[PDB]
PDB file of C-alpha atoms and ligand atoms in Angstrom:
ATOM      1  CA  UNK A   1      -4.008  -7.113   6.941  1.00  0.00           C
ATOM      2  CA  UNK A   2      -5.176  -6.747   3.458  1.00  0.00           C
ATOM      3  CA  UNK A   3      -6.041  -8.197  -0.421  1.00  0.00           C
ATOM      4  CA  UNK A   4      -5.953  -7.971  -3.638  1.00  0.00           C
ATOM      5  CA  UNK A   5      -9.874  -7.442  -5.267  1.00  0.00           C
ATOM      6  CA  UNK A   6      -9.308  -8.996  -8.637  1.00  0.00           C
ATOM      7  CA  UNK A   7     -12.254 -10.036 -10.774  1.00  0.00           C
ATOM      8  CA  UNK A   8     -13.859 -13.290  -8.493  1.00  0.00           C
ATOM      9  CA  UNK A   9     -10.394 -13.734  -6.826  1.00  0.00           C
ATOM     10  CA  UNK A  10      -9.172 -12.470  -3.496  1.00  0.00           C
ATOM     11  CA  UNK A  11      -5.348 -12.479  -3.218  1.00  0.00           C
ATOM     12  CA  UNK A  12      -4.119 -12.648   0.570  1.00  0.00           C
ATOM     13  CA  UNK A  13      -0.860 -13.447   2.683  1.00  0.00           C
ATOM     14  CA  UNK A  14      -1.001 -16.960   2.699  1.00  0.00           C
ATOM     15  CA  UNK A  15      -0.322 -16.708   6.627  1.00  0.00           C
ATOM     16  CA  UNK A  16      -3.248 -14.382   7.310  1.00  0.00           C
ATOM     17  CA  UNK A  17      -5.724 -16.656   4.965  1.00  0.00           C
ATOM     18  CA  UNK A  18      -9.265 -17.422   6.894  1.00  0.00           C
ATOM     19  CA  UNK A  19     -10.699 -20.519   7.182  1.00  0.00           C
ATOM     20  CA  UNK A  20     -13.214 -19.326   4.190  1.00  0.00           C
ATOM     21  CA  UNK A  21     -10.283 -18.654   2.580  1.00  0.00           C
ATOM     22  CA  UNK A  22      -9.368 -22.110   2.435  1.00  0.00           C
ATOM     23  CA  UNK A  23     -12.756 -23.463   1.988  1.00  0.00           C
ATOM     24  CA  UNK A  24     -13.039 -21.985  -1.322  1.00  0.00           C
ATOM     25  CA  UNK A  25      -8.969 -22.001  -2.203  1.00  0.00           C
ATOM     26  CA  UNK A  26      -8.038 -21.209  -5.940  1.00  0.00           C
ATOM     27  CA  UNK A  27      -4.505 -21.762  -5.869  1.00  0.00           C
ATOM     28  CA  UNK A  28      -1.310 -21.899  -2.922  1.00  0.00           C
ATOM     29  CA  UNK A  29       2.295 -21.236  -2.461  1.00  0.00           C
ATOM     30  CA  UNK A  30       3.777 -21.490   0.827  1.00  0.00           C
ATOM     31  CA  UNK A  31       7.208 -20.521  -0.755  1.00  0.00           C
ATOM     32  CA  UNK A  32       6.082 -16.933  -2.044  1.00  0.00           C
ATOM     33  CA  UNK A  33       3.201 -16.337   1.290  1.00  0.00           C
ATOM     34  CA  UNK A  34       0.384 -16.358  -1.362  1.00  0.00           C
ATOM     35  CA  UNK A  35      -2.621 -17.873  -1.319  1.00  0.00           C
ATOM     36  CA  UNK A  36      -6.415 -16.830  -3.582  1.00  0.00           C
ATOM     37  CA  UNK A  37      -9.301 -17.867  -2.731  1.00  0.00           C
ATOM     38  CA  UNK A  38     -12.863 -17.595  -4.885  1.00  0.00           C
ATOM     39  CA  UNK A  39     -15.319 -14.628  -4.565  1.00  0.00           C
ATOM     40  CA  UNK A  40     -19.224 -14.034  -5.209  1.00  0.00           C
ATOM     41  CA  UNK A  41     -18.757 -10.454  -5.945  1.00  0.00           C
ATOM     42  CA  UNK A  42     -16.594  -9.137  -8.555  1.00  0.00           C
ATOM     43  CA  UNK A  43     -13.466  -6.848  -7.312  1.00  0.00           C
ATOM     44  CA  UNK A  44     -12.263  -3.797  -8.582  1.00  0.00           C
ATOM     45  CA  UNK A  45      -8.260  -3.647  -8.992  1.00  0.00           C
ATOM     46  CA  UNK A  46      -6.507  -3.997 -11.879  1.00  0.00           C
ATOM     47  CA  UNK A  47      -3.478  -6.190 -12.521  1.00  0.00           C
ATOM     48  CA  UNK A  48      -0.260  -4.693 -13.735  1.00  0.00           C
ATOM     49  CA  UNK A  49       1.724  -5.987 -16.360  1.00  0.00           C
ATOM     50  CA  UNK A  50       5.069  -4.822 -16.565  1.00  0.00           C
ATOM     51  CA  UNK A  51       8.968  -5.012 -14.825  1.00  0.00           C
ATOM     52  CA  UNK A  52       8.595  -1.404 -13.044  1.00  0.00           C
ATOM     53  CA  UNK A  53      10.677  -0.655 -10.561  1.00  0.00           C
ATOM     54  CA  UNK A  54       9.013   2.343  -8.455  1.00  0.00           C
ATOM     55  CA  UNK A  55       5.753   2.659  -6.892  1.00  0.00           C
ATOM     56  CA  UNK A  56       3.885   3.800  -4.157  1.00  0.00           C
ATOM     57  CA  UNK A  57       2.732   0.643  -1.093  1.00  0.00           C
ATOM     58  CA  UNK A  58       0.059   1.159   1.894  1.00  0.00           C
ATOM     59  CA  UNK A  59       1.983   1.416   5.008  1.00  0.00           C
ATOM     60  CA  UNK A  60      -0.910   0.596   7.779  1.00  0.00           C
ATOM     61  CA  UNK A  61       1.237   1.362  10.795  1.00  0.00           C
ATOM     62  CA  UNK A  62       1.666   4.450   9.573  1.00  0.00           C
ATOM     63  CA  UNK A  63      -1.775   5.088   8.032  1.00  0.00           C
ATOM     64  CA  UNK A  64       0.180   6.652   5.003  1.00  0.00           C
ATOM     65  CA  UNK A  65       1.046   5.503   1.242  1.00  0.00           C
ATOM     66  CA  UNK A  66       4.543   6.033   0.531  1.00  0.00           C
ATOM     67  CA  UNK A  67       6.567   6.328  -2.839  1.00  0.00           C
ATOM     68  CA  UNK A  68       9.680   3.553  -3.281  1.00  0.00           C
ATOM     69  CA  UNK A  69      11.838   2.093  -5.329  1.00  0.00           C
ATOM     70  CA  UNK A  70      12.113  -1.849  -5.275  1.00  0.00           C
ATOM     71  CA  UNK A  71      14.395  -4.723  -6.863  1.00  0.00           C
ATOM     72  CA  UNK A  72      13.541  -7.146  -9.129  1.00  0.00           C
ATOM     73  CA  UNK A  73      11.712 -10.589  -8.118  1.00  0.00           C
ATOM     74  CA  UNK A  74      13.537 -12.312  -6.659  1.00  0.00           C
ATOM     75  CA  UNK A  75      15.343 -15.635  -4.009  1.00  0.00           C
ATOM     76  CA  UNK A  76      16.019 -13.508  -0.746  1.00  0.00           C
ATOM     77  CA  UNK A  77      16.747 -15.396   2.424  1.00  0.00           C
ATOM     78  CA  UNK A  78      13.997 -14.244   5.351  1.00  0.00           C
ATOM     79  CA  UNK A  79      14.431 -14.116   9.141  1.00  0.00           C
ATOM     80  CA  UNK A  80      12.316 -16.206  11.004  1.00  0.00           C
ATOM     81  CA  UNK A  81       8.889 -14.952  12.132  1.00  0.00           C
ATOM     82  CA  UNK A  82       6.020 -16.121  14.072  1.00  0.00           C
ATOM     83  CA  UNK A  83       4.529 -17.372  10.832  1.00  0.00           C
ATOM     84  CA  UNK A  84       7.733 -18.843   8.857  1.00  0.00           C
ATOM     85  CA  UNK A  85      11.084 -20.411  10.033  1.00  0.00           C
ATOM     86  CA  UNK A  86      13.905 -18.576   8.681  1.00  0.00           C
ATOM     87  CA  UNK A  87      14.166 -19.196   4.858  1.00  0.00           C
ATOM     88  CA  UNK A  88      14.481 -18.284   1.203  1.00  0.00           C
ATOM     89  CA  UNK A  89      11.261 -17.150  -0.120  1.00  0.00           C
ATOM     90  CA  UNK A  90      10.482 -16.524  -3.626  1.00  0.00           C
ATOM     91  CA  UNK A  91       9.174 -13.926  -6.042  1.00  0.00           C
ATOM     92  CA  UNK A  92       9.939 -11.567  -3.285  1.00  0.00           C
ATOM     93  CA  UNK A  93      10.670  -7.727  -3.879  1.00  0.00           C
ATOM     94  CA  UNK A  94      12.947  -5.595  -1.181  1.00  0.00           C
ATOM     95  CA  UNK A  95      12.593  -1.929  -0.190  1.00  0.00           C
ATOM     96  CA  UNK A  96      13.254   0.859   2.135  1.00  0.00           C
ATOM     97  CA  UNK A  97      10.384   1.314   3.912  1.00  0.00           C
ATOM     98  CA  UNK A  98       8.815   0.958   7.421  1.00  0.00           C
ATOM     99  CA  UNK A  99       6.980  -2.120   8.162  1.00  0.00           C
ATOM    100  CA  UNK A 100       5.340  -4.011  11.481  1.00  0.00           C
ATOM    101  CA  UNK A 101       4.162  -7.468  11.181  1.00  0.00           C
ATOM    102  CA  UNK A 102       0.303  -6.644  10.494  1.00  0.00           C
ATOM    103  CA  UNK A 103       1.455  -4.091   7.434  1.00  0.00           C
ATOM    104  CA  UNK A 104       1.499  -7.491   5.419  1.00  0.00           C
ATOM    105  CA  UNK A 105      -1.384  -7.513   3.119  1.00  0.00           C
ATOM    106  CA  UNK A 106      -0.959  -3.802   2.059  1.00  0.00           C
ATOM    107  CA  UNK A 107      -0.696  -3.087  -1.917  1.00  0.00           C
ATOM    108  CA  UNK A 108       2.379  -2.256  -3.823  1.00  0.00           C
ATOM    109  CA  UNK A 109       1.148  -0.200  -6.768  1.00  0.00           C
ATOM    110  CA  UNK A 110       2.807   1.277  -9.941  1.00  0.00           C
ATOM    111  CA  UNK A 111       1.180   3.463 -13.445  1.00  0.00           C
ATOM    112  CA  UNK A 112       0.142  -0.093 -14.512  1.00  0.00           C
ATOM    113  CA  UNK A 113      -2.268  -1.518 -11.369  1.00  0.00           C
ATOM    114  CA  UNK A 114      -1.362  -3.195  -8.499  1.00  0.00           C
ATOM    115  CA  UNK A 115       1.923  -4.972  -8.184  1.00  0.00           C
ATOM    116  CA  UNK A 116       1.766  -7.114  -5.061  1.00  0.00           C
ATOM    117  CA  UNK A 117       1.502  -7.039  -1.421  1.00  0.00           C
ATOM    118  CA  UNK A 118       3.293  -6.659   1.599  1.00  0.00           C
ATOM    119  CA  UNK A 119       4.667  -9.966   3.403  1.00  0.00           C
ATOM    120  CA  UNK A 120       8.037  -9.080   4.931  1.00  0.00           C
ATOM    121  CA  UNK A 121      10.447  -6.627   6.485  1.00  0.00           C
ATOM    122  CA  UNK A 122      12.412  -5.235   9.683  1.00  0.00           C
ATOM    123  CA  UNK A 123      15.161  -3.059  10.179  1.00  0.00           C
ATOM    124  CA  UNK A 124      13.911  -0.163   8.047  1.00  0.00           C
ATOM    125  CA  UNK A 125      13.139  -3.198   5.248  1.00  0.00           C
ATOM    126  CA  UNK A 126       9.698  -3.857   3.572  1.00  0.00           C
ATOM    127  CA  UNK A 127       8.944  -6.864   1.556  1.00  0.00           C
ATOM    128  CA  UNK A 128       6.398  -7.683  -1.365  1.00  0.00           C
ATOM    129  CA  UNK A 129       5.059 -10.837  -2.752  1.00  0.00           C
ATOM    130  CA  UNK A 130       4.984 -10.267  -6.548  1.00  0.00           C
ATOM    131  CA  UNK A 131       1.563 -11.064  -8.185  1.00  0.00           C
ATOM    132  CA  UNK A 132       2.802  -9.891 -12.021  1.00  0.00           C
ATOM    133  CA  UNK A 133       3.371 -13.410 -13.521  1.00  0.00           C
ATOM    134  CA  UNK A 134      -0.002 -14.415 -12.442  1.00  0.00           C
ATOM    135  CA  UNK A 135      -1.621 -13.981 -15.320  1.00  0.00           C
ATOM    136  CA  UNK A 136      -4.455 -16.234 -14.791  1.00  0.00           C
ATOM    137  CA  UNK A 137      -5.887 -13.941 -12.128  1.00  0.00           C
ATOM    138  CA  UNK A 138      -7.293 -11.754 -15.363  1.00  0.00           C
ATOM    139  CA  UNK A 139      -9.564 -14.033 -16.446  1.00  0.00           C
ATOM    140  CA  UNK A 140     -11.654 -17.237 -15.888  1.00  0.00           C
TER     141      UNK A 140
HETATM  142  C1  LIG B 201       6.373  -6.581   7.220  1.00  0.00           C
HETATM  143  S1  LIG B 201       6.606  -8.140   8.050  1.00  0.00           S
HETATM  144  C2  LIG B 201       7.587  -7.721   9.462  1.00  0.00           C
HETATM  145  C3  LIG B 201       7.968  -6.424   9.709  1.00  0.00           C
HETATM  146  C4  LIG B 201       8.780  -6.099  10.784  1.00  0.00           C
HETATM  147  C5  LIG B 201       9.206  -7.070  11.624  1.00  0.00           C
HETATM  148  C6  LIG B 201       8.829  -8.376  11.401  1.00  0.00           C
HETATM  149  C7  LIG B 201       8.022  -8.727  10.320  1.00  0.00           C
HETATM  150  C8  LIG B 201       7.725 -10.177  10.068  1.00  0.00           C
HETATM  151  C9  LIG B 201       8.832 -10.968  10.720  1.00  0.00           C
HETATM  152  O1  LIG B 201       8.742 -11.373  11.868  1.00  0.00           O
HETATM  153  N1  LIG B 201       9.929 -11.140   9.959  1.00  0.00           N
HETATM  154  C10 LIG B 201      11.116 -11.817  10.490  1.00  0.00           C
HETATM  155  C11 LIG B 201      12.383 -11.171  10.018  1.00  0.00           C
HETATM  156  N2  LIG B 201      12.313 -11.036   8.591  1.00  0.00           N
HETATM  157  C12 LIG B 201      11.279 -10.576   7.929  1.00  0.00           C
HETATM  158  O2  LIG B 201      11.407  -9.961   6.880  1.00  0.00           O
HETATM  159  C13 LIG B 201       9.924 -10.765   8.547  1.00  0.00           C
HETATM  160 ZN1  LIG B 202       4.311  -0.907 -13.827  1.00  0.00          ZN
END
């Protein structure tokens, strides 16, 4: 579990998104497993804005933040799950790293702010949902 804090936004896994979540829904993407819903209080991480390539993600089944290196966004074909047949899935980012179903929702993080969240992985793989080309979630 886990989310993005980002001005009145709250950016989850779309397949871990509450029912308030969709009761007050921003904006949806089954494709890329993102979903933002509104917030009364304001949040307190930052955005980055940028085409690193290293950073450091939360890693809950290990309680432990580790340092990787991760492609580009990107098209990447993803085993089926108990949330998602299997399928391409979009604006996705690959890495080696440990990750367990309920890891999703942990942040990806570079020098600039946060750089998206956890959604997939297996076999020593971790995936992240990119949230750098939504630039919207800085203002409004
Ligand atoms: C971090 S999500 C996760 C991690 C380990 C195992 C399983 C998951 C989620 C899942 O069932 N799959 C199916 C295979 N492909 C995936 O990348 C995701
Ligand atoms: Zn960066």
């Amino acid at each position: 579990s886990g989310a993005i804090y980002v001005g009145n936004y709250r950016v989850v896994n779309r397949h871990l998104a509450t029912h308030n979540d969709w009761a007050n829904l921003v904006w949806e993407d089954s494709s890329r497993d993102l979903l933002v819903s509104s917030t009364t209080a304001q949040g307190c991480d930052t955005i980055a804005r940028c085409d690193c390539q290293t950073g450091v993600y939360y890693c809950s089944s290990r309680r432990k933040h580790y340092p990787v290196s991760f492609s580009k966004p990107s098209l990447i074909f993803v085993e089926a799950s108990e949330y998602y047949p299997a399928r391409y899935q979009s604006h996705l980012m690959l890495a080696v790293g440990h990750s367990e179903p309920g890891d999703c929702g942990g942040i990806l993080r570079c020098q600039h702010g946060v750089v998206g969240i956890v959604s997939t992985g297996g076999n020593g793989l971790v995936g992240f949902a990119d949230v750098r080309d939504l630039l919207w979630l800085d203002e409004e």
